[PDB]
Amino acid sequence: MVSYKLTYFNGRGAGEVSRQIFAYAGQQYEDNRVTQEQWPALKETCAAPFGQLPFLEVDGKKLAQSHAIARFLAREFKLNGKTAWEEAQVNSLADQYKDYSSEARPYFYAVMGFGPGDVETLKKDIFLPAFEKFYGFLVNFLKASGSGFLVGDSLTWIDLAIAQHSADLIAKGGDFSKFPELKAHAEKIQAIPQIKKWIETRPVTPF
Amino acid sequence: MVSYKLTYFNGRGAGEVSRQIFAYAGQQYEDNRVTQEQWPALKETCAAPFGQLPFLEVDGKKLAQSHAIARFLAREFKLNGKTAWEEAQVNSLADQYKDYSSEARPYFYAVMGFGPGDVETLKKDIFLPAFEKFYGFLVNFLKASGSGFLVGDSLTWIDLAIAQHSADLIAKGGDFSKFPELKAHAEKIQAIPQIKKWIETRPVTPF
Numbered sequence: 292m293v294s295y296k297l298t299y300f301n302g303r304g305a306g307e308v309s310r311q312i313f314a315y316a317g318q319q320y321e322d323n324r325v326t327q328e329q330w331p332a333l334k335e336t337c338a339a340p341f342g343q344l345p346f347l348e349v350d351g352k353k354l355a356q357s358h359a360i361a362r363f364l365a366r367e368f369k370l371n372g373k374t375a376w377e378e379a380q381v382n383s384l385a386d387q388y389k390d391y392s393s394e395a396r397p398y399f400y401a402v403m404g405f406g407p408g409d410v411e412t413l414k415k416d417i418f419l420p421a422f423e424k425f426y427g428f429l430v431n432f433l434k435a436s437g438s439g440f441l442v443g444d445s446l447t448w449i450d451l452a453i454a455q456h457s458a459d460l461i462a463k464g465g466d467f468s469k470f471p472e473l474k475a476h477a478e479k480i481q482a483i484p485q486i487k488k489w490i491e492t493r494p495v496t497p498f
Numbered sequence: 499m500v501s502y503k504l505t506y507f508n509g510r511g512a513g514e515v516s517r518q519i520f521a522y523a524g525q526q527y528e529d530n531r532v533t534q535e536q537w538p539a540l541k542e543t544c545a546a547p548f549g550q551l552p553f554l555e556v557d558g559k560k561l562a563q564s565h566a567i568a569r570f571l572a573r574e575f576k577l578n579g580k581t582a583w584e585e586a587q588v589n590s591l592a593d594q595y596k597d598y599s600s601e602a603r604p605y606f607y608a609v610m611g612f613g614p615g616d617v618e619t620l621k622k623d624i625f626l627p628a629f630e631k632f633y634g635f636l637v638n639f640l641k642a643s644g645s646g647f648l649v650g651d652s653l654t655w656i657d658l659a660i661a662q663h664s665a666d667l668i669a670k671g672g673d674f675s676k677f678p679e680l681k682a683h684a685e686k687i688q689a690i691p692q693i694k695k696w697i698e699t700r701p702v703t704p705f
């Protein structure tokens with residue numbers, strides 16, 4: 292019927308939330324994964340609206356930007372929030388999640404390989420202050436909603452994105468003593484059957 | 499009888515687009531501009547959801563994050579796109595605009611007196627490459643829409659935001675030789691009567 296194709300690198304990363312949205316919705320899509328080695332020719336192809344991944348094609352029309360794609364798909368499948376106000380709070384938290392990711396990027400770059408710096412020092416000087424600030428806000432949202440979801444009484448795509456990040460940190464030995472609520476959040480979201488099923492079946496990748 | 503209150507600094511900055519959405523719509527709101535002397539105080543207060551401005555109050559309920567606010571307000575006033583696909587595209591460009599703003603930030607901060615470094619050097623090494631990349635994407639959007647607006651055939655909030663950025667850069671001595679299209683766009687959007695009136699009456703601030 293409507294045809295979806297998601298183009299991203301062969302990894303979870305910024306595409307993953309859109310894949311998880313499709314899984315919850317039970318929507319068929321083409322998971323187009325591009326390798327490091329293939330990217331140059333695709334980039335020269337001018338396919339990507341801003342020269343970057345991910346991008347989504349909906350009946351061949353192109354949409355860039357990870358969060359624009361996630362919001363677009365979540366609104367189609369009723370995962371963006373149950374009222375206008377909830378949609379906006381979801382957006383607020385997702386944008387604050389972007390600011391966390393910018394603050395933490397020097398650490399994640401050194402850890403992954405892509406950048407310079409001593410990892411122990413960046414952990415304490417850059418990652419932990421960023422993580423503690425942002426996760427304190429997550430806990431505020433959990434307490435406000437009172438449901439176990441970040442916004443309102445049901446699942447939204449920011450739950451999926453945040454649960455995936457938390458799961459990744461935990462798997463690498465991250466200490467959640469300050470935020471046991473987010474450990475519980477990550478377990479809760481990743482047990483939702485459609486999501487558990489996707490996690491069990493997706494390609495295994497380092498990121 | 500929904501009551502709106504916008505809290506931001508005494509400047510255009512990240513609050514301005516919301517003020518312009520309200521001006522376009524003819525919607526009364528409280529334009530709450532915070533002084534250096536109030537701020538530390540309001541910050542200590544946990545008034546702001548994430549400790550930062552802007553935030554919007556809607557019958558007393560708080561919403562943070564400049565883009566989340568603009569999107570919430572634009573959707574209430576039909577300035578976010580006329581179809582779900584236009585709303586996504588507005589979202590995609592607005593997010594690329596955030597990426598540009600992040601790349602240019604070292605320069606903007608130096609000019610504003612918030613950050614280190616030599617303005618002349620930052621202008622050419624950091625700002626101009628960012629500006630030229632992003633404004634080339636703006637031209638692609640204008641050519642695709644075919645109407646003089648960035649997305650589709652009528653005004654959206656990203657027109658307001660981009661026109662105001664362009665008008666500021668031009669006013670302050672910027673060279674738009676490479677992008678005559680965006681100077682025309684700025685002139686068109688800033689001549690809209692509600693907008694022209696707001697520009698002539700708002701507090702005059704450097705930023």
Ligand SMILES: N[C@@H](CCC(=O)N[C@@H](CS)C(=O)NCC(=O)O)C(=O)O
Nearest residue numbers: 305334342343344345356357358597
């Ligand atoms: N604001 C963007 C960032 C996009 C982005 O940084 N993409 C990277 C992911 S590795 C990329 O495609 N880099 C390859 C390149 O710029 O050639 C988004 O959220 O989708």
Ligand SMILES: N[C@@H](CCC(=O)N[C@@H](CS)C(=O)NCC(=O)O)C(=O)O
Nearest residue numbers: 390512541549550551552563564565
């Ligand atoms: N992602 C943000 C950033 C908000 C922001 O950086 N606010 C600055 C504006 S000057 C601020 O409130 N700084 C004062 C402070 O952090 O105490 C948004 O778009 O609203």
